[PDB]
Amino acid sequence: MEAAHSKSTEECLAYFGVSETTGLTPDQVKRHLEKYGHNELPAEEGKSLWELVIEQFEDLLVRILLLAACISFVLAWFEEGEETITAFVEPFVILLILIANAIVGVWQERNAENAIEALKEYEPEMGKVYRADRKSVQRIKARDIVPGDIVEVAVGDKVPADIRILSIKSTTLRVDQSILTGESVSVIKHTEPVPDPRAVNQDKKNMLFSGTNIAAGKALGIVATTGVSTEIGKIRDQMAATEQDKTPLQQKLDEFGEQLSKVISLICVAVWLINIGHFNDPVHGGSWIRGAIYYFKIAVALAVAAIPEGLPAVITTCLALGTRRMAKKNAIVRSLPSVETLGCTSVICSDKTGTLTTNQMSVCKMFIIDKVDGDFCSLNEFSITGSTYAPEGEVLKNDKPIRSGQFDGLVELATICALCNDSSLDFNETKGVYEKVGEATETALTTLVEKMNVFNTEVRNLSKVERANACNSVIRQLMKKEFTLEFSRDRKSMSVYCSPAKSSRAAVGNKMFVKGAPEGVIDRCNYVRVGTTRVPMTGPVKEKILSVIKEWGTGRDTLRCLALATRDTPPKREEMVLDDSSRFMEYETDLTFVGVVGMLDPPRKEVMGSIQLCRDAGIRVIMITGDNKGTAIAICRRIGIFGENEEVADRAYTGREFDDLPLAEQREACRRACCFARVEPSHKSKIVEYLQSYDEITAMTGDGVNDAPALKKAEIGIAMGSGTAVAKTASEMVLADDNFSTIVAAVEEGRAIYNNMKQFIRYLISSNVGEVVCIFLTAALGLPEALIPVQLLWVNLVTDGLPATALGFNPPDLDIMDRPPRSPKEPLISGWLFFRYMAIGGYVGAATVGAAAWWFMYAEDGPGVTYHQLTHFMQCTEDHPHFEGLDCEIFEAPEPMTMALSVLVTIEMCNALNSLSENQSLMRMPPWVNIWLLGSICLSMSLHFLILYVDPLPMIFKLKALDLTQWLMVLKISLPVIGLDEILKFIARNYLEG
Ligand SMILES: C/C=C(/C)C(=O)O[C@H]1C(C)=C2[C@H]([C@@H]1OC(=O)CCCCCCC)[C@@](C)(OC(C)=O)C[C@H](OC(=O)CCC)[C@@]1(O)[C@H]2OC(=O)[C@@]1(C)O
Ligand SMILES: Nc1ncnc2c1ncn2[C@@H]1O[C@H](COP(=O)(O)O)[C@H]2OC3(O[C@H]21)C([N+](=O)[O-])=CC([N+](=O)[O-])C=C3[N+](=O)[O-]
Ligand code: ALF
Ligand SMILES: [Mg+2]
Ligand code: NA
C-alpha cells in the first residue's frame, strides 16, 4: 500500500480487507505472497572471478596489445634454421605481461566487501504476526511476512517491514530510526494520519520502518510494503545498480589510448602512401602471403612503441606506496585510484552526527534561582565542559571552576537528574571508553551528575568501571524510587515517586521529581526553589526563567532544554491511579521549579580548523544531515560553515523544502546552500549528484547507514572509523582516527601524489614518442629494423620502468595546500609542452635511425655503403651489381640495433633527469635532488650491460656489447639532449607564462 501514512487505520485495514482482530487468512497470505514476493532484500554478489578476468581485457590499449600479440604469433611461424634460436620469444613476452600484469588487476577488484550484505544485517530473522490461522501471536520467519499482515512489535524488536501503526499498547512507542536518520534519539509514534503525502521519514510518526528498532513500548500494526518497496529498500537500490565512475586521470588515459588507436592505425596506412612504388613495375619475390608480411610487422612494431606498457605497473606502485603512507596517517584507502581523485576535490559533503559531532549528548549549560525580590529575579547560571559521556569535565560559574555541592539548588537539580532517569552509563573495558545505556538524553543527565559530584564523593581512586555510576548510586541511596509516571504526549514530562530511604510506607517526606518540556512543567509550578527554601512563583520570576530558556533554545547555541521540578507534597501512593496515564499531569501539579539544563551533541574539537584549512585549499564543505535544521544551523555556526551572525534564509533547507523546489532550483540550491537538514538517504545522493553535474569532484563523509547512498555516489566516500559497517563498505577510505583533520592531509597526499604521476606519465609517454619516430623513419625511409618489438618492451618496463617509479618521489611543493582544486579536465600535455615533447620526440626518433645508419656508413666495422643503397638491404641477391661489397647475411646482426638501442637508453636516462621538473633549468634545480632517480639510472644502465655480457640474454634480444669505442659515440648522440630541452625550458621560463 502506497502512502499508508496518509490514510487512517481503518482505511489501511480496509485496503487489504483484513481484520485487526484476526489477521490474514491462509489464503490471503498465499495470494499476497505471490503478488508481492518475500519480505526480503535481493542479495547482490560480486562478479565471479571469470568476470574479473574478462574485464581486465576491456582496455583498448590492451585489446590492441593483444590483437598485435596475435599477429606476432601468426607471422611467428616463418622462421628457419638461421634464427630458429629465437623464433617465439616475442609472442611469449608480448602476452606474458599482457596477462601477468592484467592478472594483478584482479587483485584490486576481487578484493571488496559487499555493502548490501552489510545492509541485510538489519533484516530480523523472525517477526510476529496474527494470522487468521491461530488465536495466539505467531513467530515466523520475517521473509515470510507480506503486505496486509498484522504485525506486533515490542521493546527490543528490530522492525520486520514498513508498517503502518494500528494500535499502541504502551503509554508510548519509542523508536530508534538511525538507519534512516543517523540520529539515535527516540522518536515518539502515534496512530493518526499524516496528511502530507510527501512527508519525509522524520515526519511519518505513524509508521514503523523495516530495519529500525523499538526502544520502548508495544504496538500492533499492518504491513504497508515489504522487500525492496521499503525505506531500507531504497537505500538497497542506490547501492546495487550504481557502479563508481572512472577517475579523472583514468579518463585522461582513455582519451590518450583512444587517440593512439587512430594515430597508429593512420601511421600504417601512411606507409601505404609511401609504398606506392614496388607495386607498379613488374617484380616478384614471393606470394602475397609471403610479401604482405611487411605491413603486419610494422604494426607489431608500433604496438610496442606506442602503447606505453610498464605504466600500468609504475602507477599501481606509486599508489600502493601512497596508500601505506596515508595508512600511517590513519587513512585506510580501500581504492587505490581514489587517492589521486581526493587530490582534486572541490566540494566536501559531510554528515553531521558522529561525523562532525561526537554523537554524545552533553549537558553544557544549567541554571537555578539565585534570589527573588518583587519584580527582581536573578539566576545562578553555570556551564559544563566535556563533550563525551565520560565523567570528565567541570562546572563553571563565569568561566571559573566551582563546587556544585556549594549550591543547594544544584544538589536538588542533581538529585532530580539522577532519580527521574531510566538510563545509566557503562565503561566498555574492551574499547576503553564510556558508553551510554539507554536514551542519549538521559545518559547526558547521568554524566552530568557524575561531573557535578554534589556530595563530594571520592572517585579518583575508583576503577573506570566503578567511576561510571558512582555519584548516581550515592543519590540513589538517599531516596528510594517507588515507581515512575512514564512520559505522556499530552504532558510532555515525566516523573518519579520517591520516599526517603529507611522510612515507613506511611512515613511523610515522599517526593515526586519531575522532568520535561519547560513550558508545561513551568506552568505547573506554583513555587520556585531558592537554595533549600521555596517562594511563590510570580509573574516576574516566570518571565526571567522563560526568557533564558528562550535564549538557550534558539541562538548560536540552540540547546535542547529541560525544566526540573519536584512536588514537595505528592499525593498519597494509595490515591494514585498508575494504570491511567491521562491522570499523570494532575499528579504532577503544585510543583516547585528547581532548574534547567541545556544539552546538545557537540562538534568535534578539530573540525572548525579542518574546515578553515579546506577553505584555504579552495574546498567547500556542505553539511547534509537527518537531524533538525535549528540544531543543524547552530552546529554550522559553531564549526565555521556559517558566520556567527550570518543570514542563512536561502543557505539552509530541510528535505521537505528542498523537495518543493523545481528541478532547476534544487540544482542551483546545492551551489548556494551549505546546510541541508531533516533529509532522507536519497536526498544525500541527490545533492551529491547535482554537485557532480557542475563537473565537480565531490567527496562525501559520514558514518551512518543513511549515508551509504551518498558515500557510494560521491567520487570519494569517506567513512568514520567508529562508524557502521555499511558506511565503511560503501566508502573509498576510512578515517580509523575519526579525525576530520585526517581528510585534509589525505587531500594533500592526493595532490602531492598526482604531481609526481604527472611527471612519470609524461616521461613515459614521451619515450614512447621517440620510439614511434624511429619505426616510422625506418619504414618510409627504407632503412632496416633499427629496433625490434622485442626490445622496446624491456625498455618500457625495466629501462624506463625504473626512472618512472623514481620520479614518483620528487619532493612536493610547499604551497601544495595554498592553491585551489585543479580542474578535472586539466590536460597533461598541451601547448609549449606539446611542442617541446614533440621536438624531443622526433629527436630521439632520428637519433636512433641515424645512429644505426651511422654504424654502417660513416663509422667502423660497418661497410661505408652510402644511403643510395643502404636502404636496399632487401636487395642483396636480387641486385648484386648495384649492391655488393661485403657479406650479405649480416644485416640482422647485433650492430645496427646494438647501436640504436644504446641511444634510446642513454637518451631516456637523460629525459628522466629532465622530467625532474616541467619548466625548470637542471642547472637551477639540482638534478641530484631525487637521489632515487640517480640510483634508478645506475640500475637501468647496469641492466643494459647485464643484457649484453651474459650471452643467455642478448641471445634473444640480439645485441652484442660494444667496446670502449663505439659507446663513446653513443654518449655524444644523446648527451646533447640535455641542452635541447634546456633551451626549451628557457623559452618557457622567459618568453612565456608560468
Ligand atoms: C604513444 C606515442 C605516440 C607518438 C602517439 O601517437 O602520441 C600522440 C597522442 C595519441 C597524443 C600526443 C601524440 O601526438 C603527436 O605527437 C602528434 C603526431 C606525431 C606523428 C609523428 C609521425 C610518427 C601526446 C602524447 O604527445 C605530444 C608530444 O604531443 C600528448 C597528449 O598526451 C597526454 O597528455 C598524455 C595522456 C596520458 C595527447 O594529445 C595525445 O592524444 C590525446 O588525446 C592527448 C590529449 O592525451
Ligand atoms: N509530535 C511531536 N512534536 C514535537 N515534539 C515531540 C513530538 N513527539 C515527541 N516530541 C518530543 O521531542 C523529542 C524528539 O525530537 P528532538 O529532541 O530532536 O526535538 C522527544 O524527546 C522527549 O519528548 C519528545 C521525550 N520522549 O520522547 O520520551 C522525553 C523527555 N524526557 O522527559 O526526558 C523529553 C523530550 N523532549 O523533547 O524534551
Ligand atoms: F549523522 Al547524520 F545526517 F548527521 F546521518
Ligand atoms: Mg552520522
Ligand atoms: Na564513493
UniProtKB/Swiss-Prot annotation:
Cystine pairs: C876-C888
Subunit structure, as described in the record: Interacts with sarcolipin (SLN). Interacts with phospholamban (PLN). Interacts with myoregulin (MRLN). Interacts with DWORF. Interacts with VMP1.
Pfam families with a match to the protein in the record: Cation_ATPase, Cation_ATPase_C, Cation_ATPase_N, E1-E2_ATPase, Hydrolase
Tissue/organ expression: Skeletal muscle (at protein level). Skeletal muscle, fast twitch muscle (type II) fibers.
PTM-bearing positions, type Phosphoserine: S581
Positions annotated to bind ATP: T353, E442, R489, K515, R560, T625, G626, D627, R678, K684, N706
Stated name of the protein: Sarcoplasmic/endoplasmic reticulum calcium ATPase 1
Segments on the Lumenal side according to the record's topology features: 70-89, 274-295, 778-787, 852-897, 950-964
MF term (GO), any: ATP binding
Cytoplasmic compartment spans: 1-48, 111-253, 314-757, 809-828, 918-930
Residues annotated to bind Ca(2+) 2: N768, E771, T799, D800, E908
Note on domains (UniProt): Ca(2+) and ATP binding cause major rearrangements of the cytoplasmic and transmembrane domains. According to the E1-E2 model, Ca(2+) binding to the cytosolic domain of the pump in the high-affinity E1 conformation is followed by the ATP-dependent phosphorylation of the active site Asp, giving rise to E1P. A conformational change of the phosphoenzyme gives rise to the low-affinity E2P state that exposes the Ca(2+) ions to the lumenal side and promotes Ca(2+) release. Dephosphorylation of the active site Asp mediates the subsequent return to the E1 conformation.
Gene it is expressed from: ATP2A1
Binding of Ca(2+) 1, residues: V304, A305, I307, E309, N796, D800
Organism: Oryctolagus cuniculus
